[PDB]
Design a protein around this motif. Structure first.
Motif, short mmCIF file in Angstrom:
data_model
loop_
_atom_site.label_atom_id
_atom_site.label_comp_id
_atom_site.label_asym_id
_atom_site.label_seq_id
_atom_site.Cartn_x
_atom_site.Cartn_y
_atom_site.Cartn_z
N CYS A 40 8.62 35.94 28.46
CA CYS A 40 8.75 37.51 28.60
C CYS A 40 9.66 38.03 29.47
CB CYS A 40 7.25 37.99 28.65
SG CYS A 40 7.15 39.62 28.93
N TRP B 98 1.75 41.46 23.60
CA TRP B 98 2.37 40.52 22.62
C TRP B 98 2.52 41.19 21.22
CZ3 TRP B 98 5.68 37.22 24.77
CH2 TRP B 98 5.14 36.83 26.08
N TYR B 99 3.75 41.53 20.58
CA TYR B 99 3.62 41.88 19.19
C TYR B 99 4.30 40.77 18.38
CZ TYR B 99 2.63 46.84 20.12
OH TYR B 99 1.87 48.07 20.51
N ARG C 249 0.64 44.41 16.95
CA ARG C 249 0.17 43.82 18.33
C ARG C 249 -0.81 42.44 17.94
NH1 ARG C 249 -3.98 45.57 20.25
NH2 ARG C 249 -4.29 47.20 21.91
N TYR D 61 -3.48 41.83 23.86
CA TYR D 61 -2.94 42.40 25.09
C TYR D 61 -3.41 41.78 26.12
CZ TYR D 61 -6.97 45.68 25.64
OH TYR D 61 -8.07 46.05 25.74
N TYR E 136 -3.74 31.88 20.65
CA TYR E 136 -2.92 32.11 21.47
C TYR E 136 -3.25 31.90 22.92
CZ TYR E 136 -1.33 34.54 17.30
OH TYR E 136 -0.80 34.65 16.04
N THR F 293 -2.20 32.81 26.88
CA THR F 293 -1.66 33.66 27.93
C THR F 293 -1.75 33.35 29.30
OG1 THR F 293 -3.11 35.17 27.23
CG2 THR F 293 -1.11 35.59 26.21
N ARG G 33 3.77 34.26 30.08
CA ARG G 33 4.18 33.37 28.83
C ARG G 33 3.06 33.42 27.96
N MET G 34 3.44 33.40 26.61
CA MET G 34 2.22 33.20 25.73
C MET G 34 2.35 31.90 24.84
SD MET G 34 1.06 35.30 22.22
CE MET G 34 2.85 35.76 21.53
N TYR H 158 8.60 37.14 18.15
CA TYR H 158 7.57 37.87 19.05
C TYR H 158 8.25 38.58 20.37
CZ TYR H 158 4.63 34.33 16.65
OH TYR H 158 4.05 33.96 15.55
N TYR H 159 7.52 39.49 20.42
CA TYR H 159 7.87 40.75 21.54
C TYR H 159 6.74 40.76 22.59
CZ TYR H 159 11.76 42.69 18.52
OH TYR H 159 12.76 42.69 17.79
N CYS H 160 7.20 40.65 23.83
CA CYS H 160 6.16 41.26 24.88
C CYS H 160 6.22 42.76 25.05
CB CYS H 160 6.12 40.42 26.10
SG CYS H 160 7.42 40.63 27.01
#
Length: 215
Positions: free
Chosen positions: A14, A21-22, A32, A35, A54, A56, A63-64, A77-79
């Motif tokens: 990220c 994280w989405y 989402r 979080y 998941y 984190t 990172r995830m 994936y997006y943070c």
């Protein structure tokens, strides 16, 4: 852009205190997954999402890791994090994975305009809340969600640069108009709902609407 294969694992990094994280799957609206608060190392998973899937970590560090891949983990994936002044949520670069073996709707269809001509993208939303915000984003071909405008449920109509929201609370409609459409505006535009401006607040997205500026 990351290839992988079921039963394996994957590490989304990220590049941005609360991180969101989405996951954004083809043709679906972004969502989402959970979080995570760095400070506390706490994590809060969303409904149905399974703990121990998941993982984190971090606070360069963040990172995830996904635990037991399956073709459905496929997606990008997006943070994300609220801006320092809660005007907007910021999104990270975007990471496409491929595993190999309150409502918001923007039904508008791919639109095509010539250059230097306007476009109004529709967005209709359902909500129980007295008060909320609407955020419009542009998803680039590089897969980066850029923020454009925000309309407050109690503000006058949004104007910023070439961006304009015509706000219609009674009918819960928030169509974005982009004014002097230029080649580079050719993208997919997402419309998002949120309730309050707080570390934990999430965004509920429409499936978005392709724009293609033509010469």
């Amino acid at each position: 852009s990351v290839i992988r294969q079921t039963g394996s694992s994957a590490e989304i990094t990220c590049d941005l205190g609360y991180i969101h994280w989405y996951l954004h799957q083809e043709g679906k609206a972004p969502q989402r997954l959970l979080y995570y608060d760095s400070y506390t190392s706490s994590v809060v998973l969303e409904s149905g999402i399974s703990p121990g899937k998941y993982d984190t970590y971090g606070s360069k560090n963040l990172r995830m890791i996904l635990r037991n891949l399956i073709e459905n983990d496929s997606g990008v994936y997006y943070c994300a994090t609220w801006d320092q002044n809660y005007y907007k949520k910021l999104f990270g670069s975007g990471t496409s994975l491929v595993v190999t073996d309150q409502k918001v709707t923007q039904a508008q269809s791919s639109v095509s305009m010539p250059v230097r001509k306007a476009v109004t993208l529709n967005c209709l939303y359902e909500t129980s809340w007295w008060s909320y915000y609407i955020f419009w984003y542009k998803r680039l071909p590089s897969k980066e969600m850029i923020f454009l405008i925000r309309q407050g449920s109690d503000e006058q109509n949004a104007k910023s640069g070439r961006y304009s929201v015509n706000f219609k609370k009674a009918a819960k409609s928030v169509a974005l108009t982009i004014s002097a459409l230029q080649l580079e505006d050719s993208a997919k535009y997402f419309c998002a709902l949120g309730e309050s401006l707080t570390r934990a607040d999430k965004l509920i997205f429409g499936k978005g609407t392709r724009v293609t500026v033509e010469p």
